[PDB]
Amino acid sequence: KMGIGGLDKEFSDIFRRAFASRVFPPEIVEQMGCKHVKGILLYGPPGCGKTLLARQIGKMLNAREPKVVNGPEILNKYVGESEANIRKLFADAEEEQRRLGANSGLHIIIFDEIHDTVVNQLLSKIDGVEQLNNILVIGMTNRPDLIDEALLRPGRLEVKMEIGLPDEKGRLQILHIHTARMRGHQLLSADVDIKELAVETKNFSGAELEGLVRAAQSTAMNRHIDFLASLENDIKPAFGTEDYASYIMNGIIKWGDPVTRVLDDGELLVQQTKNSDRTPLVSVLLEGPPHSGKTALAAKIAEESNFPFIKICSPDKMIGFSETAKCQAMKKIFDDAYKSQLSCVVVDDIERLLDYVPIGPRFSNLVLQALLVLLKKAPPQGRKLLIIGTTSRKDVLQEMEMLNAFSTTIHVPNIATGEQLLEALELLGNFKDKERTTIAQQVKGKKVWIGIKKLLMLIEMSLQMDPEYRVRKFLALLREEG
């Protein structure tokens, strides 16, 4: 039962289907009256550690086949020739088979990196004309699509298996074996925790794990002449595969009662999603003054919900794309949303997303159509999705029937109160405590109309000039901004 991290459900099924039909002795097969499977093929993303699995599986099936290995080129040697060779490794098995056919000979052949003559030659040997059973062949390849259709068909390669990147629990299994090997000998790093490593990594192919640990070992070697694992997390991948930290640079500071009302309302919306059998799709939008901080809030709502799949959609990625191309990427995101039973998606800068321009007005029809249809569009029954839109300008959106589409509308107004502004200032903690008092003295009797994004920028702008200057400059700046 060792060793292979994760892939136990998949392993159990695959194992059962290929091996069990062979294993039952001996009447069971005739009672079934079903011919033995010819081959099993596994296709995986690179770094999924296919080879070890194949050697192990082959080893597991027979005491000794004993294993046959084929070079990747396969058809090397021009004169005759290679075709004959492709015929030949099969040929040994078939010879054994003609010599003993009935019972009990098994040969294991594996093809790594699986046109003209070779397609037919292999296809002919694996199935037909007569017999050719009592042997199995496994092909390991990075891409399914590359491979030939004929093999795919039931028969010669009836079953094709796809290996997902290891699960967090699975990831824990792969890390767990290397860690365990390190565990058995006395030396270890106390700081490192298996659970912590597992929670930290979602994306990684197997390979990634052995690689990171090995690299950590190298850093440790360097040390001799968290810890090393933490350093590997810091660098090593290169993983190749949702950052909220890029959308909440600045904190959901509790500047105001409005912040709380919007968030509690967000909780009402997630709660609303949780069941929602009567209504499948959840649509929410945020309408705010520019520099509203609406997007920080939306990102925070997505983080708070923690639905199994939450993916941000970004305006920034769309830039410079053909309008049709913009639609295409967008649709692609939409289908990606489908897989989770419960799911959250973000629409940001919709005025920007649309490519809407105030003069004209001139705007992109196709993007608008994708947006318009999806809220009406229904995810398959069972699986569900919630939609969040951030809009700088409300009226235009109302105008394109977009408002009509959304289930709920929320407002996140700029603070109109000097004291709330003061509270926000305290939360940001930038200027000194004398300054806090002076600002507090100035705000009373005055009305403030400024966005938080704008506000952070304003504070920062006032700060660079010298201390006597900062109070006056900031007040004057506020006056101008007003």
Add this chain to the structure above:
Amino acid sequence: KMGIGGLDKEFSDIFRRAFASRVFPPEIVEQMGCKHVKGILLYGPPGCGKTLLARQIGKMLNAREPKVVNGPEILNKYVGESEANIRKLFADAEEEQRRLGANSGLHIIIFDEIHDTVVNQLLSKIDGVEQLNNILVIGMTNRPDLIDEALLRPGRLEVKMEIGLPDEKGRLQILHIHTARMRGHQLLSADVDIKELAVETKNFSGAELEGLVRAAQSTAMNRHIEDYASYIMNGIIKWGDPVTRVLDDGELLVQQTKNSDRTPLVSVLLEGPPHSGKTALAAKIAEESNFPFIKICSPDKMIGFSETAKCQAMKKIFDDAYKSQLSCVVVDDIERLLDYVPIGPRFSNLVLQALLVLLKKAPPQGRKLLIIGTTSRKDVLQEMEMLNAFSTTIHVPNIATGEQLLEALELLGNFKDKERTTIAQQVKGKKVWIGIKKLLMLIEMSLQMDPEYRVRKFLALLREEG
């Protein structure tokens, strides 16, 4: 005349054209002075029960040909060799014919599951240099485009006939033999039903059936050691007589359409202001018809498409409707297909023309079809001049009285007797105006609040959607 279910029309024409000119004895070919057809070709979709049909045709042509079977690979053995084989099977027919050429020998050869030298080699055998007539070869294949160019033209394979999309019945037959084998053995699965199995799968090739069976055997082995429903998940309430009345009027349109020859087409238009539930009502109308082919087209299916592509989809669906004797077609989000935007105006004209023209257009004689559309903006549509094109106008309205409201809350059964007792006490006598779906939404928006904040939140929502 047996056995092949359906495919009597295609069969009748095909048998006649290939077989009748040869069959007629004997002055007829000369009196006609027309050369016998070299071959007949059929191209078909997977799961069509092809092998049996080919067997039947070959059997039908001669008392005994007697049948020639060609292996799928055909050309196996590169070295000499294959070329000799491809030339050779033809060669035998040629030998018999040269030996007796004049009258009266016919040989039938069939190649299953269809370049360089072989292209020319086959063309040469089928036609020329001299004669090579008095034999026929039929090729049956899943995809048209793959096969060679030289062939299509009148002559070697002058007529190519395409079978209609595969009958389930055959699929049921191929499955039926394997199922029968399991029936035959004592062992069987209670859960498997021939009817269920046939109904779930459409696309699949023959091959696929025995394959599925192998998989079922494997599962047993493991043990020993176009949807109507999805579209309308909610189902339909009947709060008001108008609501019943639209279904009755719709049913009447269907009756008219199916029963009467005089109008090939009727156009069904639903007038509602969104968020109306009318789209659903239209789908329902289609369901009640029980028409042989009813297809509902969804904009999302067309989402992100270029104008031309949407139009092509429309053409495909509608053309699909033409082939059937009669059909019901439901059109949804008519504004969206149009891509009307109130600003502008911006809309796609080309689509407007395709739909509007087709709407006037009628299928070839002996067939009739029914078109149903959902429109947000009857006024805007009339402004286009498209509304005039539609045969009939039907209007579906949002609730207007407190009474329709409680009847709906009751039919849905979400709120308590108490809840409904408070709501009625807050609406009865007053005036309301809210579409059905938002209501179904607000309902969910109120169940999210605590058991005591539900009434207030509900009434708050209804206070906003005014």
